[PDB]
Symmetry: C2
Subunit: 237 residues, 2 copies
Amino acid sequence: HHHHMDSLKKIVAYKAVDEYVQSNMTIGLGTGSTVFYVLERIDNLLKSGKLKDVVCIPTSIDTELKARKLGIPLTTLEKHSNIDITIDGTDEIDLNLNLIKGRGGALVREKLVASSSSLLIIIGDESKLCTNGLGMTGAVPIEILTFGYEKIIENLLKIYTLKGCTYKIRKRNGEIFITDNKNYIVDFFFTEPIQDLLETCTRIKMTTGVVDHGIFVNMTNVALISKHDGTVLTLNK
Amino acid sequence: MDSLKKIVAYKAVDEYVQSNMTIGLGTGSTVFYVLERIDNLLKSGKLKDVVCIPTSIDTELKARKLGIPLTTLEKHSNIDITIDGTDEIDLNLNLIKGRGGALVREKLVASSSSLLIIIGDESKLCTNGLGMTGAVPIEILTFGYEKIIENLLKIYTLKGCTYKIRKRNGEIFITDNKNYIVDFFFTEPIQDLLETCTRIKMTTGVVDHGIFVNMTNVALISKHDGTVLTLNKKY
């Protein structure tokens, strides 16, 4: 139900802005179709004067372009930067508030900005909420260098918890997808939930050729999940 | 130093490089004569059916121009032998590399190799601790780089350091992987070397770093007296 899903996205997005974003804040902006309504709302409130002195840091080039068209003030991640709040979406989230992210290709700058913020708010419709184990609804992305990427993938497959996976290099329009950071992404697929989750993150990240991966562990402070019945579930660390 | 570079480069090729090998090609001014010499031997017929993988675009072009057969690092490539230079090497045969900008590809190529051979002159051999002779390079994203640096300075072993973003021709150097490099400088030897390695690598926004631990099998060190010291780690 497409307008319905849109409305559900809208609801959580408006809520994150209305309830958590304040004037004179620096705000990290996530990526994707849910976050769209975050940009909409922030621009709305800024134009009305309900909000003032709000500057944003974008997690992708897509998000930067959209924000700039709207006229939302933007800055950049410097040594002095500290972000009050980042609002982003996710591809999956469990009841521990651990996330699978990156299916829109923005995972690396999403993690950097989110780790650089006092508060990470993750927003989603109820299909993102996965209560029977992470990693089974789709791609678990890993950003890797273009140079020698197949060798990097073979090395990833040694990791004991990934040895059973299938995988596909990410493609758009029959071309290998290139990230903002000029890397490639390999999607690993799991038929059972990802085992020893934190050890997996660590072994992926320690891999030569790996830039980062789409698993965010112990980073989410708040989640707002919009349910079909009208409700919004708030989850806190 | 150049004839000292020539001698270790020729020794390295002549004594380890065989026909039918896949060869990792390093980067820089010593490795220029590895290239030179591999050309010579394929062309003479002394060597054959040797194919190469370059650790930089710079090395690729020079080799492509010499007529060295080149291939890419594919799913189950094994490199028989990589030959590279180094900025520092100690007697554990641990290295500091990347002062020419190529640390990341160098590292991946070398780790994909059955044997890593490090060549250099006397000045590279560091017997009083690693990391004091110049840049210790950390490859990082261009996005939010100032913030990645700040997060690197949280590491207890880096906290003290002088550091400088890497420039060349008045501009921030851009690596073959389209990243930046931040150089760290130490006045004492790097502490807790492996821990430091790990904490850098685990840093969000870090691609890799130029500390190469337990990866070198053989080093050839050209001496001022013209001889070459060969170091060999079985371990």
